[model samples]
Target: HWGYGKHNGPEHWHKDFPIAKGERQSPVDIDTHTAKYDPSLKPLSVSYDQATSLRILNNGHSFQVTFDDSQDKAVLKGGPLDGTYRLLQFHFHWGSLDGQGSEHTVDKKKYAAELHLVHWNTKYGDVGKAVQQPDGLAVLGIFLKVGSAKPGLQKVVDVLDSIKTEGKSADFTNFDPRGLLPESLDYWTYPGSLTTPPLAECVTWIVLKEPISVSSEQVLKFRKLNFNGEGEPEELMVDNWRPAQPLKNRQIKASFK
Candidate 1:
């Protein structure tokens, strides 16, 4: 029922999900000037098997690519995590227009888009159960800049035409998420919650400092997605992102000095 509309936007999310006003909400503004550099933070270790990607779907909120997370086939470790976290899914948030879509901003400067790779700690078995605990989730946030078209992203774009409406899905595999990342894994870590409803306060946010490039034309393709299903008046799926939240007594630890 919640959406990015005038009646049920993020400003009113607290009406149903009280945790929206919680101490540590996500998509926070990263003030690189003030973030503390912690050398103790280890380099991120990502092991993603291209075959682990199972399907892609337009969930109405955003288009996400789900993975076969039943095992440790695709897992994240070493960076601000105690143990291994299984890759659940990856999705993007962007604005309908250019220059204003990313959820997390650096020094209040917004990016063209944002990518969230959602993961869950294996201690709790699954995301449903893990999301309730403090150390339940770990989301990797990558910023997207508008520039040259990325060859690594064409595979994802090719499927958008097939899944133009909400609830539509397709079998998508043999894609490596690592290909979408920047060369540097240096990041800023903080304690936060899910950027959407339920807004669970269980995520360890690892936001990369470097941004990947995507051409302006390719970025427009995302705007063509529809939030409504078949037979319904199509609503463009854009600006599907939460605004930055209050930092509130949390210290952001940087992986590089």
Candidate 2:
């Protein structure tokens, strides 16, 4: 839904979705000192399809994507985790300008961008309904830094031409999100909430410490997502990220061995 009134934008989102009031949100400070030292997290099981099943949607604020989730599992503590979850949707947050544009923050630092891979528990049937449950969501966050080139992102950038028009989306077939994963699977995990509206406190956030690099030009292209109406053409969507919140006595764990 479009913003209402003069001050009805995201600044006022909490008023509408009061659940956001107590939510333990993600993209928070990832303090290595406080992280639980777990030495036995098996490698995450993910594969690349490189083909269709990935749909990019112009969800007004940014480009959100949906991908296949029929075959995904996570291994924790050297065994398959009991709670079965499926990948649901993926999206990004960026800045209005070039300097910073990510949702999560660490040590008061804002990266160029942040990507969220949303997943839901299978016990609730599907991600649509599962996302409502507090323990039914999983999010993998990867930070993006401004750099010289982003060869790994060619597939995603290639589709910008088709989605250039506001509210426009294409088939985006033959695309697999696994390709987006950073080379290192080691990540810091925590119990957190959705960073956006309806900020449900049901997400398990796995944030990768290592950052992936993308070109300055590519970063500008991502900012092209427009919230303006069609008649007005499209405006660059910079500074889409929200500032990081306090840790609130929360603990983040990492899987290194």
Candidate 3:
């Protein structure tokens, strides 16, 4: 069911997962003209615990990692919205092949992959409860393209040997997501819903324009992850990306001013 073909691609994702309809989808063709420029959208500072480890979760649909809250630090004091939030989790959406794998599109062009950094409003008890609130979540989107080998990602890829099978996860110690973020803080933001099930509409999206580079071999390795783990070898779990959806009446704002 996960092979590459007609009716089996990301375009048909909504069909298999009806819950994707209400959730805020990514890979939207971003146009600066349609974005509202605001200089106050930049974050004052970002900090995370060095000991923060990443826990890989291969949930049939995609590969996701939940961050250990005990080591996250994100401080925002001078932005349009000022507050301190903790990093919750991060995940990826990729194409079956190495050439394309990004979740968010630009001018109808899809990239190699997309990474999402999820955070919760600390003002509200915790991330779990915050996600339930209308304005309690902030998700950062980073694009990834196939290129030369990336040393920064070696930490993540190194553990693939341990959790090569689907639904299998290992204790990934000392994984800091801060190094994964793009150097440019400039971003485009807007109000959107979650990309997963239950499709909660309580997310504030900040999508970076700059994309990170990774080797084609790395992407190929990522595509090898099965949706159902080593047990369901029949089902090829490749091309785990979602297609772009209509923006509706929502306006994307930029912090480039």
lDDT of each: 0.91, 0.68, 0.69
What is candidate 3's lDDT per residue for 10-40, written digit by digit as tens? 4555666664565355446677677889755
Best by lDDT: 1
What are the models' TM-scores? 0.98, 0.86, 0.85
lDDT of 2 by residue, 82-161 (tens): 46567666788887655577777665678889988776777877766767777777777899888867676777776766
Candidate 1 yields a Cα-based lDDT of: 0.91
Q: Which residues of candidate 3, in runs, are more than 4 Å off?
A: 1-27, 49-51, 70-80
Candidate order by TM-score, decreasing, is 1, 2, 3
For 149-223, candidate 1 gives per-residue lDDT tens digits of 888888998899999998999999888888898999999999999998999999999999999999888888998
Model 2: residues >4 Å from true position, as ranges?
Answer: 1-10, 40-42, 49-52, 70-81
Where in model 1 is the C-alpha error above 4 Å? none
Better of 1 and 3 by TM-score: 1
